[PDB]
Write an enzyme that holds these catalytic residues in place. Structure first.
Site, short mmCIF file in Angstrom:
data_model
loop_
_atom_site.label_atom_id
_atom_site.label_comp_id
_atom_site.label_asym_id
_atom_site.label_seq_id
_atom_site.Cartn_x
_atom_site.Cartn_y
_atom_site.Cartn_z
CG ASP A 171 33.89 21.85 -3.00
OD1 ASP A 171 33.29 21.26 -3.93
OD2 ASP A 171 34.43 22.96 -3.13
CG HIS A 172 36.76 20.01 -5.76
ND1 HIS A 172 36.27 21.27 -6.04
CD2 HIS A 172 36.21 19.18 -6.67
CE1 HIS A 172 35.46 21.20 -7.08
NE2 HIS A 172 35.40 19.94 -7.48
CD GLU B 207 36.06 16.26 -8.96
OE1 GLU B 207 35.83 17.08 -9.88
OE2 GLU B 207 36.46 16.61 -7.83
CB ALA C 150 27.52 25.78 -11.57
CB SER C 151 30.10 31.17 -10.61
OG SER C 151 30.20 31.11 -9.20
CB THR D 25 27.31 29.23 -6.19
OG1 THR D 25 26.28 28.64 -6.98
CG2 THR D 25 27.51 30.68 -6.64
CB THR E 116 33.39 32.66 -8.99
OG1 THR E 116 34.54 31.83 -9.15
CG2 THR E 116 33.63 34.00 -9.68
#
Lengths: 298, 305, 290, 299
Positions: B80-81, B132, B210-211, B252, B254
């Site tokens: 992730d990132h 991305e 996308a939270s 997800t 946050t």
């Protein structure tokens, strides 16, 4: 590296120092305790009650055993106060290097019977055992404490590796009005009859500074009282080789959680409040090791 | 069991449902996520940012891989990132089954260059790669040539980026962004844009930031400790359409932090005498588990394991 | 406990002794070597070639890494002679604590580029790297430059040995002067590859149990003793292990035709490897060094 | 993925097929067995005897468990014929998912006491147990060494054991009986009605002729080797045998290859060159076994 209790506890008593056992229920506590041990170059015991195994599950047990193995200093993983033969078996299954069943509330013959059966299973698979005689409650005249004579017989009939003794300590933040009484002469007597390393539970110090830090933040705590440091030092010089600490850790951890969230209303990132809490735990563990004299003993 | 996710995600898009990726930083979050996965019998992705890796260290990484293996549903462990090549290398070393390098802020050639280098490293060791294109920034429905090449993924570029790099997934920029402030009112999601990109990029698509940042949660948080602004998350319906349009993986973070903290605050606020960690981390972990579950209901991964 | 090669090799040269790097391909070999290190209270290195990794798979790498951690002596797990950057990646992925890519056969620049790219990936994850310059000669000055360009951690030099059961005719060459010269320009621990002793006794035993072996020739003990004193901190060992193992599998099966229980012929074979490892540790001077 | 024996065995008996349990003593054997199970999309059981525990030590036990968890097919790790409570405890300690103790030589009550104690320890730990009643001996005196059915039902009820190993004619080794080993199917079929829990058949190697002669060729000597006929296996399973153990077939296959490679190449001393094809032969045997048992694709 993973080792049994007996391993380091013997050098502890022979050397005149104590090895701290620290209770853990999750990742941050485990890290705090292990980093403290690494930096202080001290042996250490990770203590996991049944309450811990319940809250922790597989996540906790496999991680503790894994980090214990990967650590550079000696680390044993103990199941504290197991309540049944079955509980002990689960601890053996999950890789604990030392177990103990608490049947100190039972009559002598029953305690010996239960304890001996635990000793045979544990030793069958290279695990050590901590026996328990006497009840952890503050105060003698009623003899609710460890009978030194019974202690030698208990250790002989069972083949336990070390003994938890009742000389005045008790779990929790209220160990007594003011400085709790610790029966040292009773401890010395037991020590003369039981050469095996001795264990001291309910040993948190519950330091006033810490009690006040809790209040200053979230607050709400009464006339908390812990075991005086001088008594810990004396009990160790008499043979206490293992000392458990759980309450001081919980208090330090929550005090930081409360002040961080209290001072930062907008904060909702877990690590921002649990991280500082973890650090505070680590610091407590270190002073604990310094107190026990286990520093540089790895 | 431990999987790379490509198979998880391929089946997700092929069947029009999304798989949830959830960020974790310790034991409590990992348990909640995985238990929610066992219940619901849903495939799941354990996401660990670079912050998670620093905060959790070996304790976290070792635990997540284990457990993932032990699980009775398909589980993928993603970076992730990732910020750099060396970051991805640390992830490969710690057993992650899928890595991600984020060079969306760099020009196309540098992005392609960096990403491609990651694909070669990852694929050499059987690990999948997410990449991305486009910056994850929100946009209103006013901007013209802006919500085009300026920001947000350009389909044609997407196909080309995916072909020049050996990436397996592809996170797209269509109006979402991290944090609790995704945009005044309902943040605009460029659905047509997503549709075009999907038509050109068959690989599974990924949606970050996308939270939902549910109002009730916001209010529950304020009701306890408090202090949060006009929290605004991505609308559930936009999540559904986006998923029906090719979004196979949804991140997800946050929502979980908020739920967890909301509970820590209220438990400690209601019981000042409490200092046993599990008394407040336990109910906080439980609220996270419930969040994950509903999340899986919205994604349509319930029973897809 | 599992550690990088540097940690163990650095003290080795600084203490005047050598650490053995023994190649393993399965369980019995890994056990023979670890048990030897335990008894001898010696630090050890488990070497796995690309062929080893191919033959053993994840079954072997997982095991080697696990047994190494649980070991009561310092243990390093090395990729030995990696042939590609991808090969090294795999080694880092499998938990190795040290890797090396063999590009000596390439020109200096190629070697340096390839090696530097390996040093960057390994270091990024806390793994050390061995670099090779020469053929299993090496110029003491080329090494210094080679090392400073590619931040490798330890260096294997071509001094006159050669990996095989035939390292010459009379006696294999060991240019001690060349070693001292390089030892003077390279403070990092030095490595000696293809230094098997291919003992006469083992050659004879191998033959007595059927099986043919040419005019076996290996490195001499004194040369090892001197090479170590001059700076060699790691000595790769393989040939002698395969020989002893096979030597025993053969005579056990020859002297017991009815025998089809694998442990009956692999067990005593495992035993022979453990013994070779122990005497190998004595020679290097790593006994009681853990 | 790691599972107890009971999971796959219950499914096996209901569906009518058997799951192979194969003994392993090192890496090559474990790899051959698991690869076969993967390629055949079949569940499999890794069996380890006390000899295996001693020979392989912690190296073997930790590896078998780890590879079992890793597999993409159901894998159980059973202790086969434990000789004591302490032995069974060690097996629980090392992560086995099924254990068993063999006191079938002892009288009934002693056997029941010993098994029940093992059952309590295993179940408290989420591990299943196989009980043993009767002596594994070939036949052509009646119940002197065979499995008395009615006694089984009583044995299973008093000892909460999960599955039962029966003695209906099998025995360990490559000498099971002149001609075609006699398998007391009726005996099996009755027990089957009195005991619904999955059944286990030990000492079930086939000891195929083409392997025996393969052994003699470029190799050692062997007597009038004889194993259980494939038909006796196919039917025993239809009547309730859910678990079949194979050890000898693998040892023979493996040694045969070892002996042929070494014999054909005197200069060879690279272990992988003779253990490698040995491992391949055992793998082919395992695959054929799964086929014979009917477990292919049952993963």
């Amino acid at each position: 590296m993973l080792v049994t209790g007996l391993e380091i506890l013997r050098k502890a008593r022979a050397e005149g120092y104590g090895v701290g056992a620290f209770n853990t229920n999750n990742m941050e506590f485990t890290q705090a305790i292990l980093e403290a041990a690494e930096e202080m170059k001290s042996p250490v015991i990770l203590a996991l009650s049944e309450g811990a195994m319940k809250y922790g599950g597989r996540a906790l047990t496999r991680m503790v055993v894994a980090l214990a193995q990967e650590a550079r200093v000696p680390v044993a993983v103990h199941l504290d106060h197991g309540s049944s033969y079955e509980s002990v078996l689960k601890a053996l299954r999950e890789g604990f290097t030392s177990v103990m069943i608490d049947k100190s509330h039972e009559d002598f013959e029953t305690n010996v019977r239960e304890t001996k059966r635990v000793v045979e299973a544990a030793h069958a698979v290279g695990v050590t055992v901590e026996a328990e005689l006497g009840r952890l409650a503050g105060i003698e005249k009623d003899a609710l404490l460890t009978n030194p004579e019974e202690a030698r017989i208990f250790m002989e009939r069972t083949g336990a590796d070390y003994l938890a003794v009742a000389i005045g300590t008790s779990h929790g933040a209220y160990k007594g009005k003011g400085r709790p009484f610790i029966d040292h002469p009773r401890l010395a007597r037991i020590a003369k009859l039981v050469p095996a390393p001795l264990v001291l539970h309910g040993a948190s110090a519950v330091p006033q500074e810490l009690v006040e830090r809790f209040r200053a933040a979230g607050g709400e705590i009464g006339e908390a009282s812990g075991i005086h440091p001088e008594d810990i030092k004396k009990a160790i010089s008499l043979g206490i080789a293992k000392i458990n600490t759980d309450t001081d850790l919980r208090l330090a951890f929550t005090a930081l959680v409360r002040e961080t969230l209290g001072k930062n209303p907008k904060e909702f990132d877990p690590r921002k409040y649990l991280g500082p809490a973890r650090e505070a735990v680590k610091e407590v563990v270190k002073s604990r090791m310094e107190l026990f004299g286990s520093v540089g003993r790895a």
